[PDB]
Amino acid sequence: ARRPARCYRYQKNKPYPKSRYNRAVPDSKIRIYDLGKKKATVDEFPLCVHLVSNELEQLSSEALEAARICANKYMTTVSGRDAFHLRVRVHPFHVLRINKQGMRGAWGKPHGLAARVDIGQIIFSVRTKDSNKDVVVEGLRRARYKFPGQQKIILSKKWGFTNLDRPEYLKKREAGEVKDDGAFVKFLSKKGSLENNIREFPEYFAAQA
């Protein structure tokens, strides 16, 4: 057993997901996808760090869980559990097949589950404070070893996971059109109703600081 990712590496087949035509597939081994202080705010975590791909390939659900475990262990041993929020941004939806006389009836049974990653696609995202840039970089360097192919750390200059580069987001915050939700934020748009906009963003519609 345990055929290599070198023979399940490239994207050769069409996406073959779990559906009503394909049942009795084994479960993925990755079950948790967000990690660290996942209830924190983008207020608390300004800097984003992205592990991105350079190859059009397939990532095993095993490679995802192993990279997540090693990265997690490194950041908790160094910087503690609450200093980061790590989210894996690929979900294994590909049922890989195994054949297991001759080539007659060669259509194979389900064997796995894979994340088809494109060039320039986020694999790992870590949001953290400005002082933990080093430790999140070396944790994602450990992640780059359990993951096949070539990957890059890009210092994402978006405030947290969201959008909206840091001066733009600072301007939005000091304008007051940003409301703190659970692990995310809500934005004021100039297209909704006046009454519900009033009752959901009082600070923009007041003379507050």
Partner 1 sequence: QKDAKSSAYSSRFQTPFRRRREGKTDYYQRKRLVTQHKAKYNTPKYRLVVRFTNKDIICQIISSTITGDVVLAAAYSHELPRYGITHGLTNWAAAYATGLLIARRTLQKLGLDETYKGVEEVEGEYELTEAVEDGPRPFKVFLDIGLQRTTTGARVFGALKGASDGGLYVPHSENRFPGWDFETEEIDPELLRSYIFGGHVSQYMEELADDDEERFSELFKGYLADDIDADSLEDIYTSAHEAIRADPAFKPTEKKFTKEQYAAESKKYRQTKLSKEERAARVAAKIAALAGQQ
Partner 2 sequence: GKSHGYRSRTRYMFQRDFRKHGAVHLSTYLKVYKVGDIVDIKANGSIQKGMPHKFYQGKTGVVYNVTKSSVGVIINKMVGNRYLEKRLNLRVEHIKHSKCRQEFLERVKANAAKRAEAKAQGVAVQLKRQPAQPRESRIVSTEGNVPQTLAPVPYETFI
Partner RNA sequence: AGCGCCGUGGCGCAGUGGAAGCGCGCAGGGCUCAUAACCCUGAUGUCCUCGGAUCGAAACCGAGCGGCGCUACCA
Partner RNA sequence: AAGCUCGUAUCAGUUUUAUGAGGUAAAGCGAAUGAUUAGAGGUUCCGGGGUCGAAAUGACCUUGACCUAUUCUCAAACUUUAAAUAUGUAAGAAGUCCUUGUUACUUAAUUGAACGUGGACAUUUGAAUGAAGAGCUUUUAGUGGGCCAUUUUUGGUAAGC
Partner RNA sequence: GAGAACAGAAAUCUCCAGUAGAACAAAAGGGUAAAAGCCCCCUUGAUUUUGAUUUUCAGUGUGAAUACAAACCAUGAAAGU
Partner RNA sequence: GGUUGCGGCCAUAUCUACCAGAAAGCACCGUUUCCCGUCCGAUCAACUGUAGUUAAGCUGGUAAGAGCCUGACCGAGUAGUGUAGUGGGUGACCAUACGCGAAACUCAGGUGCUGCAAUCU
Exactly one of 98, 155, 170, 175 binds RNA (CB under 7 A); that residue is 98
Q: Which of residues 143-162 bind partner 2 (CB under 8 A)?
A: 154, 156
Asked if 175 is part of the footprint of partner 1 (rule: CB under 8 A), the reply reads no
Exactly one of 44, 70, 89, 137 binds RNA (CB under 7 A); that residue is 89
* Smallest separation (angstroms) from RNA to the CB of 134: 25
Residue 9, phi then psi, degrees to nearest 5:
-95, -60
How many amino acids of this chain bind partner 1 (CB under 8 A)?
6
Among partner 2, RNA, partner 1, none, what binds residue 3 when CB lies within 5 to 8 Å by partner kind?
A: RNA
Write the binding mask 162 to 201 for RNA: x where contact by CB under 7 A, - elsewhere. Answer: -------------------xxxx-xxxxxxxxxx-x----
Exactly one of 13, 26, 81, 154 binds RNA (CB under 7 A); that residue is 13
CA separation for the pair 91, 120 (Å, rounded): 16
Asked if 127 is part of the footprint of partner 2 (rule: CB under 8 A), the reply reads no
Residue 94 burial class via C-beta count within 10 angstroms: exposed 0-12, middle 13-18, buried 19 and up: buried
Exactly one of 56, 78, 122, 183 binds partner 2 (CB under 8 A); that residue is 122
Among RNA, partner 2, partner 1, none, what binds residue 206 when CB lies within 5 to 8 Å by partner kind?
A: partner 1
* Smallest separation (angstroms) from partner 1 to the CB of 207: 8
Exactly one of 98, 154, 175, 206 binds partner 1 (CB under 8 A); that residue is 206
- The one-letter amino acid code at 201 reads F
Exactly one of 130, 194, 196, 209 binds partner 1 (CB under 8 A); that residue is 194
Residue 116 burial class via C-beta count within 10 angstroms: exposed 0-12, middle 13-18, buried 19 and up: middle
Q: What is the binding site for partner 2 (CB under 8 A)?
A: 50, 52, 120, 122, 154, 156
